[PDB]
């Protein structure tokens, strides 16, 4: 690292250095603290969506158990490091079999993003874990469970990291604003909550980019308007107006309204499709055929947009799909 902090992104600057600094997962953190205070630590398996605080939790845990130099006492392997079955047969076996080199303690092995390991590597790791579990504990961080061997799943204690609720994001945002001498309006905070979609890195990145957006970093408050231009996400009022124009107004008015909304501040049809999806999910529909047609046609449109294409034709397709789906209901 260079120049200590203040030269890092807010994602890597506000990384929790203690188990007390991890928010949201209250149950998991309390259970882990009880585990390490009572002296028992089984093979841990942390599962959850990206950005929920798995590797931060395990790094804080290893820092708490050991001294400051946790990296000198932990064999932390990642997908960047080669993890073939020869690596399991040699490096993992030697680290598990031998005694600690710096003090008296149990060896800890952290396998971040272990879902990328091959099937044979996991098969070897099975017996490696089970044989030398007396003085060596394995931790597996996996975003995807279908890539893990069921034998490996049946061996490690499963901990699920839920997406961060509202209160955890609010507390972290309050801490960040206190540190950074920054002010932010509550409606902007709610917009950040809706924009996060359970991710914390998204929140930190949007805060950093919005502080960069302001001409004067101090004094000026971050409103939801600044959030919406900086992220580029559609405003809820724009989505409501577009949906109303589509539902009631005819083709000329609806097409002109959608084009004007998109060209006002450079909206994309994506993020607008699932904004409309959220708004329509907030409706009650008497006929299931409306739901079926909406879901199928909008999924096809989103797939086509993901593959890329002509935006005008896709917008016309969106309008046609919605208007054809809300006429079968009556």
């Amino acid at each position: 690292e260079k120049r200590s902090k203040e030269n890092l992104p807010w994602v890597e600057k506000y990384r929790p250095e203690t188990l007390d600094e991890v928010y949201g997962q209250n149950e998991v953190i309390t259970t882990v603290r009880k585990f390490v205070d009572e002296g028992k630590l089984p093979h841990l398996l942390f599962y959850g969506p990206p950005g929920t605080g798995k590797t931060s939790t395990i790094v804080a845990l290893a820092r708490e158990i050991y001294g400051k130099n946790y990296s000198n006492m932990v064999l932390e392997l990642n997908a960047s490091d080669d993890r073939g079955i020869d690596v399991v047969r040699n490096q993992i076996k030697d680290f598990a079999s031998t005694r600690q080199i710096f003090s008296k303690g149990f060896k800890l092995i952290i396998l971040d993003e272990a879902d990328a390991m091959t099937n044979a590597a996991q098969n070897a790791l099975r017996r490696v874990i089970e044989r030398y579990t007396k003085n060596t504990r394995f931790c597996v961080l996996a975003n995807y469970a279908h890539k893990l061997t069921p034998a490996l799943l049946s061996r490690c204690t499963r901990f699920r990291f839920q997406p961060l609720p509202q209160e955890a994001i609010e507390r972290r945002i309050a801490n960040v604003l206190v540190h950074e001498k920054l002010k932010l309006s509550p409606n902007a905070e709610k917009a950040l909550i809706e924009l996060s979609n359970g991710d914390m890195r998204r929140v930190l990145n949007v805060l950093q980019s919005c502080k960069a957006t302001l001409d004067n970093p101090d004094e000026d408050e971050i409103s939801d308007d600044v959030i919406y231009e900086c992220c580029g996400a559609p405003r809820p009022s724009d989505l409501k107006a577009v949906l109303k124009s589509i539902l009631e107004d005819d083709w000329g008015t609806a097409h002109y309204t959608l084009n004007k909304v998109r060209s006002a501040k450079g909206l994309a049809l994506i993020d607008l499709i699932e904004g409309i999806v959220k708004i329509l999910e907030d409706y009650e529909l008497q006929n299931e055929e409306t739901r079926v047609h909406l879901l199928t046609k909008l999924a096809d449109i989103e797939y086509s947009i993901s593959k890329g294409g002509n935006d005008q034709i896709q917008g016309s397709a969106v309008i046609g799909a919605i208007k054809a789906s809300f006429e079968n209901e009556t």
Partner: protein
């Protein structure tokens, strides 16, 4: 001109020192100071720890006012040392917190001059203060004898168990082919002072070690005529190879159970 200057008497010394622990370690963290140059490096399995230290007396000329952290890579370092005549005089050159160092492979003493440079590597791992402690035993046997014993026993088992009890060194390695039980009785000789099995005793020790790591240790036996092994039940094994002005330890971690 440059802040850090270290002109070796010969490139052979540095080549031998690097090749001593090149195989067992990938990343090396040199720390140049006015007292000398040290290098604390850890194996990938984090079992075998190497602590190089070269005194100021092994350099024909040496000067380094500001402490420098030279994190490097032994593969590319050995590749750089591979090219260049061994009789040539190497001169390590570095700047004030640089991105690289300069290897003066000055051929003979005139004419050809080389300027091989290796980009410096950002190793943020601080040096580990594992110097020594109250060791239970302190033996000292010739490097050739220890290397021969380790090479003979590695073919019989995957683990060599070193036992010291009542002024006696005993190596045992039980495996599939057989079980070696090479034993050594301490002695001293005035006729040939180099071969002398020195020993000290506080408490008996029964520590087992891997075979490949011990082979990695004995690969460095060419540097020193004598090797000093110190063991303890609550300390990693120490293998102090004595150099012309410094030393080269090997902190090996024993197996448990």
């Amino acid at each position: 001109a440059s802040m850090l200057e270290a002109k070796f008497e010969e490139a052979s010394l540095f080549k031998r020192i690097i090749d001593g622990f090149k195989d067992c370690v990938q990343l090396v963290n040199f720390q140049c100071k006015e007292d000398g140059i040290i290098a604390q490096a850890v194996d990938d399995s984090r079992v075998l720890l190497v602590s190089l230290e070269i005194g100021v007396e092994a350099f024909q000329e040496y000067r380094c006012d500001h402490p420098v952290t030279l994190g490097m890579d032994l593969t590319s370092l050995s590749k750089i040392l591979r090219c260049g005549n061994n009789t040539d005089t190497l001169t390590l050159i570095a700047d004030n917190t640089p991105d690289s160092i300069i290897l003066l492979f000055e051929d003979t003493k005139k004419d050809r001059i080389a300027e091989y440079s290796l980009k410096l590597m950002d190793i943020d791992a601080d040096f580990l203060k594992i110097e020594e402690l109250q060791y239970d035993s302190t033996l000292s046997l010739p490097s050739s004898e220890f290397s021969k014993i380790v090479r003979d026993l590695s073919q019989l088992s995957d683990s060599i168990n070193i036992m010291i009890t009542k002024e006696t060194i005993k190596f045992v390695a039980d495996g599939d082919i057989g079980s070696g039980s090479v034993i050594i009785k301490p002695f001293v000789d005035m006729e040939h002072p180099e071969t002398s099995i020195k020993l000290e005793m506080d408490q008996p020790v029964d520590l087992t070690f891997g075979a490949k790591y011990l082979l990695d240790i004995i690969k460095g036996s060419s540097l020193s005529d004598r090797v000093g092994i110190r063991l303890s039940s609550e300390a990693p094994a120490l293998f102090q190879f004595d150099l012309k002005s410094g030393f080269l330890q090997f902190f090996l971690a024993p197996k448990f159970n």
